[PDB]
Design a protein around this ligand. Structure first.
Ligand SMILES: *[C@@H]1O[C@H](CO)[C@@H](O)[C@H](O)[C@H]1NC(C)=O
Ligand SMILES: *[C@@H]1O[C@H](CO)[C@@H](O)[C@H](O)[C@H]1NC(C)=O
Lengths: 349, 352
């Protein structure tokens, strides 16, 4: 019926029309970490070489560690290693660790093979704990933690069969795994995306950021291989910071805005949108305050400030939508209310 | 933008929302109606075109030529109505589609009496004229390249759609070298990528590095592929690109391959090409430092029709760069005949 590798159909949903064909399709998609023995050996070596724990790149890696925890600890127990892997909650932003899990090239002896084992006995706890995120910087600082250690294999990831085959890197790097990245353009609309970011861009006088949905705040570097228009861009003209996995792209820009370093990156989940916060208004006045830490539309008392301003940004105003409320861009300050009364972002990319 | 897709290779099916770049290669000549401005405005633009020295048109794409062809009758009729002894003659597409240094002017004073819509029929065709406004078709002799308009039209905001085959266009306000970004679709997922439009289908992949996998060109246009619709547009010299920048090649690392540089002298006279990394049938290429130097792309067959069996290259890589056209299989510039004297071979007599 067809001699191609991929076939897809777009739906026009009222016409009853339906266009099929072949090509490349980027959907809004917003675990086998090596052989068990090899991973276990990597963790043993990790402790034995100073690395106390892990800072996950994404909300994937964390979930994986969580789903591997039992078998990993059991195998560590089998081969005489008093060490317990503890997997905690994801903390935003997902900070960059200087370490990475070493390839042992000498996998632990008496584990088995596959990753889907059950009905076994859980291992015992230990004073020695291999930490994985979850509010534990006090007992294990960032700078002794592995980060971005895993790479998806060649055909390791797919959406139709939800297996994800991973390996421990041979090299250290800052690049986000390009296996799960999908970027596309069509006429005056475009998108950069992965499993966490959904970043839309449009064409209105200039190419620019339309809106973005972040489900995580990672700090890896979005590869240019999977980025559009990567030349002639001052890093400070971006919206989503480079150090926040923002694509080095002209698509990642907006007239009258600079890099949102001090955005509300402590949030679980943000929706960067160009719309006034509910009940608020914004004026473009050169008498407004200078750009500073992103402020929330509501005070700690939940009091909603009405009038805001910006020195020379453009409308509609940049804003972040989190569960705790609505934040404004760095350029946008309260017009009348003194900044000292408002909730500010205590974080920096 | 809602859809479903199946990947046989990894055996999987998926639905959802997102962005979908299809192989829409060949501006499906059987089916689009074109609306190049209002009839009167276009007519005025052509009148002014002659009256300002521009004798004719060099089309950017096969689509523009087809459009002109489908507009011809009504255009000439309207020119006739308003007392303008001028006949638009549309000829065949010639490759490469050469870049004309000029473009149709916006009159901002549309011709007075013509009609308003573009779909009229049952009318009397206009009479011919000594004055001819040429559109491609072997006419450089009676009108040289450098007196022709080129890349004059822009697709409107929501002017192009694949679902309703209407195409709404306007005459440009400014001259430019950029390919119309309206019909351009570019995408990456995992280790596979594509840069495409209604003329090009350029596949790149990820082996050790990113590289050109294979390309399919139903036309040889000479506009400039915009960086806005291109991936990885930094850290590449114009000479790194396999498909020449002046041959609408994307400024991209995706448009590269180890052991090969710009195919300026590729077989760009062809009506159609499949750039493939695979030996020409009945030939073998040897990486030899004793080989000849880069020159015009040679066809794997003599003009008489015989296969040259042995080829070589100074420092290129295998499989060899080749171009598949209806008239045979050409090699990349880096690849030369191992023994046969280049005198009796067929060479590309064209340059991007
Ligand atoms: C986008 O362009 C339209 C004109 O077509 C304009 O009305 C609109 O305000 C622009 N978008 C923004 C956010 O200004
Ligand atoms: C790179 O491509 C060659 C053929 O062009 C293939 O044989 C090889 O396996 C590829 N590299 C890898 C790492 O698979």
């Amino acid at each position: 019926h067809h001699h191609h590798h991929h076939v897809g159909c777009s739906v026009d949903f009222s016409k009853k029309e339906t266009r099929c064909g072949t090509g490349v399709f980027v959907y809004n998609d917003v675990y086998h970490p090596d052989s068990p023995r090899r991973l276990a050996a990597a963790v043993k070596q990790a402790w034995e070489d100073g690395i106390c724990g892990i800072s996950s790149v994404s909300r994937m890696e964390n979930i994986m560690w969580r789903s591997v925890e039992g078998e990993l600890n059991a195998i560590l127990e089998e081969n005489g290693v008093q060490l317990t892997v503890v997997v905690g909650s994801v903390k935003n932003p997902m900070w960059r660790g200087p370490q990475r899990l070493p390839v042992p090239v000498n996998e632990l002896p008496h584990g088995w093979k596959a990753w889907g084992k059950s009905y076994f006995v859980r291992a015992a706890k230990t004073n020695n704990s291999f930490v994985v995120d979850g509010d534990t910087l006090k007992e294990c600082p960032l700078k002794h933690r592995a980060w971005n250690s895993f790479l998806v294999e060649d055909h390791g990831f797919g959406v139709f069969h939800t297996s994800v085959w991973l390996k421990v890197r041979e090299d250290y790097s800052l690049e986000c795994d390009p296996a799960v990245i999908g970027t596309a353009v069509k006429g005056k609309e475009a998108v950069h995306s992965d499993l966490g970011y959904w970043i839309e861009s449009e064409k209105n006088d200039t190419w620019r950021l339309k809106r973005a949905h972040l489900i995580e705040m990672k700090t890896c570097e979005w590869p240019k291989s999977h980025t559009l228009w990567t030349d002639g861009i001052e890093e400070s003209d971006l919206i989503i910071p480079k150090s926040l996995a923002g694509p080095l792209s002209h698509h990642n820009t907006r007239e009258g805005y600079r890099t949102q370093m001090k955005g509300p990156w402590h949030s679980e989940e943000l929706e960067i949108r160009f719309e006034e916060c509910p009940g608020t208004k914004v004026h473009v006045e050169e008498t407004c305050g200078t750009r500073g830490p992103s402020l929330r539309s509501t005070t700690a008392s939940g009091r909603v400030i009405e009038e805001w301003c910006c020195r020379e940004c453009t409308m509609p105003p940049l804003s972040f939508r989190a569960k705790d409320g609505c934040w404004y861009g760095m350029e946008i300050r309260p017009r009348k209310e003194p900044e000292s009364n408002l909730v500010r972002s205590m974080v920096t990319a």
